[PDB]
Amino acid sequence: IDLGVAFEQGKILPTPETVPFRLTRDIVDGMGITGVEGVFRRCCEKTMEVMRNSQETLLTIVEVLLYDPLFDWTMNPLKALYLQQQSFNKVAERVLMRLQEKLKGVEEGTVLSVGGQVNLLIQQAIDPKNLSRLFPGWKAWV
Amino acid sequence: GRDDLRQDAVMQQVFQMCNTLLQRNTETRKRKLTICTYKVVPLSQRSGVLEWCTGTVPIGEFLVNNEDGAHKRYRPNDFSAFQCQKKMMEVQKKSFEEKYEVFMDVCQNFQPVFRYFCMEKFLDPAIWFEKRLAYTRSVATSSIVGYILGLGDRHVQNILINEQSAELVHIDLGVAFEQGKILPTPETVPFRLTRDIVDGMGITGVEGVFRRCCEKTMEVMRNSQETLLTIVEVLLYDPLFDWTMNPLKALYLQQQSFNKVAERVLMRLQEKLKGVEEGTVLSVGGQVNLLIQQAIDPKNLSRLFPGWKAWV
Amino acid sequence: ELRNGKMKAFLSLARFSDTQYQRIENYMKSSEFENKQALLKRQRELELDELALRALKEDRKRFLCKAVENYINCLLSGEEHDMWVFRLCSLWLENSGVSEVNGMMKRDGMKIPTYKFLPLMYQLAARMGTKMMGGLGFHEVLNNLISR
Ligand SMILES: COc1cc2ncc3c(c2cc1-c1cn(C)nc1C)n(-c1c(F)cncc1OC)c(=O)n3C
Numbered sequence A: 001i002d003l004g005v006a007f008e009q010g011k012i013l014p015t016p017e018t019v020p021f022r023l024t025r026d027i028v029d030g031m032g033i034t035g036v037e038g039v040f041r042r043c044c045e046k047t048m049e050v051m052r053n054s055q056e057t058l059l060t061i062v063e064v065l066l067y068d069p070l071f072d073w074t075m076n077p078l079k080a081l082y083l084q085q086q087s088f089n090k091v092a093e094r095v096l097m098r099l100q101e102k103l104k105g106v107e108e109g110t111v112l113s114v115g116g117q118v119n120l121l122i123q124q125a126i127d128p129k130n131l132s133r134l135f136p137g138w139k140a141w142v
Numbered sequence B: 001g002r003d004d005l006r007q008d009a010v011m012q013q014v015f016q017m018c019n020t021l022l023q024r025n026t027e028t029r030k031r032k033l034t035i036c037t038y039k040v041v042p043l044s045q046r047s048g049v050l051e052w053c054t055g056t057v058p059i060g061e062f063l064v065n066n067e068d069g070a071h072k073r074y075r076p077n078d079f080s081a082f083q084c085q086k087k088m089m090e091v092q093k094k095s096f097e098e099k100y101e102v103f104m105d106v107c108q109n110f111q112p113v114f115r116y117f118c119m120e121k122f123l124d125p126a127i128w129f130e131k132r133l134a135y136t137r138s139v140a141t142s143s144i145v146g147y148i149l150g151l152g153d154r155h156v157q158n159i160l161i162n163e164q165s166a167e168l169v170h171i172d173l174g175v176a177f178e179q180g181k182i183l184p185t186p187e188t189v190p191f192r193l194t195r196d197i198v199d200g201m202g203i204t205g206v207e208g209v210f211r212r213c214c215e216k217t218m219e220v221m222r223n224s225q226e227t228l229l230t231i232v233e234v235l236l237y238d239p240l241f242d243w244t245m246n247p248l249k250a251l252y253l254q255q256q257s258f259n260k261v262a263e264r265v266l267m268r269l270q271e272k273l274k275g276v277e278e279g280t281v282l283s284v285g286g287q288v289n290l291l292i293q294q295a296i297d298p299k300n301l302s303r304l305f306p307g308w309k310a311w312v
Numbered sequence C: 001e002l003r004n005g006k007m008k009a010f011l012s013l014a015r016f017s018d019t020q021y022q023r024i025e026n027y028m029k030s031s032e033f034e035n036k037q038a039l040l041k042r043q044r045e046l047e048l049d050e051l052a053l054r055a056l057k058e059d060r061k062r063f064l065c066k067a068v069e070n071y072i073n074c075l076l077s078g079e080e081h082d083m084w085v086f087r088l089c090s091l092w093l094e095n096s097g098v099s100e101v102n103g104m105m106k107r108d109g110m111k112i113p114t115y116k117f118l119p120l121m122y123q124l125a126a127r128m129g130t131k132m133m134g135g136l137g138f139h140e141v142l143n144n145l146i147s148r
Helices: A025-031 A039-053 A055-066 A077-083 A087-104 A114-125 A128-133 B006-024 B026-031 B059-064 B081-093 B096-108 B116-121 B125-149 B195-201 B209-223 B225-236 B247-253 B257-274 B284-296 B298-302 C002-029 C031-041 C044-077 C082-094 C101-109 C114-127 C138-147
Strands: B040-042 B048-050 B056-058 B159-162 B168-170
Touching (some): A039 A055, A055 A087, A055 C082, A055 C114, B006 B026, B006 B040, B006 B225, B026 B209, B056 B059, B059 B159, B096 B298, B116 B125, B125 B168, B125 B284, B209 B225, B209 B257, B209 B284, B225 B257, C002 C031, C031 C044, C044 C082, C044 C101, C082 C101, C082 C114, C101 C138
16 A cells, blocks of 8 residues: 555655565565575566566556656655655656666666576565665564 | 878777687687788878788779779679769669669669679689688678677778688778768668678578578677677777767768767667667577668668668 | 457557657667767758658658557457557557547547546546647547547
8 A cells, every 4th residue: 555656766765765675574474484485486486477578568558657647756855755754758768768677677787587587686675785774664674 | 191090900909809709719719700800000190001911802893893893794784883873873862762763773783793703713612612601701700790899881992802811801990889870871781791792602692601600709799798898998988099970070981978979889889799679688690680681671771872882 | 260360460560560660769769869960960961861850750650650550450359459558548649749640549549449448547537638629639539538
């Protein structure tokens, strides 16, 4: 719920979010003894491969969505202060491009397989380096 | 005299590095895929001295010489080179469809005769086969390396063929890094692969040894993408390198923004090396096929400058 | 089966035309094009550039029209590729002033079943206005589609 922040706009925030998603210790404990190594990794790679196969449809949908006049995705200082107590065309092209590398699988200029991308995402999500930097309100330890 | 030879020297150095990279790989080493190189010794800004390649003749001199060219001794009833050039110059100001019609009309009445080079110079079938294979391999490696470095202005007088070895040598390397596309009437081909070069390969054309040598060279280029990227990055930031196209050279060829254009060229070369073309990742075979079809397309050839002599 | 074959044939043609049109648009917005134009800006060369630009715009319009026509034809036949209405409406909205895509929407866009446009209702209703009018005006066609 509360889907206001999307398209990597949290990275622009002060104290940026440095994790692709929430994969804290409580979530990992939820799966069980196997952790992320079990069914989680397999389901992630299958859904990632499915999203890769349909990259054109997703790109078209997101392009239609972001060009909506009333969608209002771009982060502004008011929302930045609220969350943690024309250039629009360029930003839209930039986020469309970034979504394109995500769908194709290019991370940091390196092409990756579905398994490699999933492993990179998991290791970023569970990395204490990244989790320590997050906002206290994010509650990474929880 | 009155010419800058430093660019040729540094292009020769990059060619030497590419030769070393090709020699390292076993697959290319078995095929003896090499880039012909020469020593260039610039003496000043406007003067220099460089090696003279003995035993070589320009392909333009052999093919379309008016008094003793191949197209005159062979196929005498066809159009002379003068008529073809005159028609192509006349159709320059007209629309693109008129350009295409005139270009196809010229090509229909001007047929390639370059296959007879090895046939006349080498009468022993074994030697003829060896020289033809060497010619095809040289064309393939030169085309791939030129595409990687964005070599341009590859007209008839800028290519030499060695009479003894039947191998192609490329000269006048001033224009590179895809700067030919920034020119007026821009060049729309990765490399010169016109009807004469294809015909000289044999009856198979590009279907046989040429395609495979292209994939092997491209695979070697891919496996060494990081070293090539570092070499090119060192080269381009040379203060005296002077690769960016300027209007004076633009008019001469056809009778800080530097940081941005440089980083753009680096990203373009990186995309070429990884194989990302028109935004789609491609295998080595697919990239080779795309390059070949772009090179041999009459649609692209028609729009070219008549000085480039596409029909030749 | 004849219908299903037509739908796939129309979709394939639409995708190819869209690919060519997107390539042309990317070249138009590419930095190499603006660099070449700046190099020109530094007398026959200007005329040659004008002819080249006009022909390129003509080719872009032709490819866009073919893609729009084939998308309209594909959406009429069946229901496996309803999600391409996103691409169709993106092409229509971005090219508001073409006056040919608007005409095709007025003629054959209405024949599409209305439930297919349901996922795009938010964006379609956000875009719709009253500045443009006429039989082929974009706003009038959009209002008619919303009403239907
Ligand atoms: C390393 O440089 C060269 C070596 C050559 N070796 C043999 C040879 C050449 C050579 C031309 C160059 C060269 C390079 N640059 C930048 N300029 C020139 C000129 N020419 C030749 C030609 F192909 C075109 N134009 C003139 C030419 O001779 C004067 C030729 O007919 N033969 C047999």
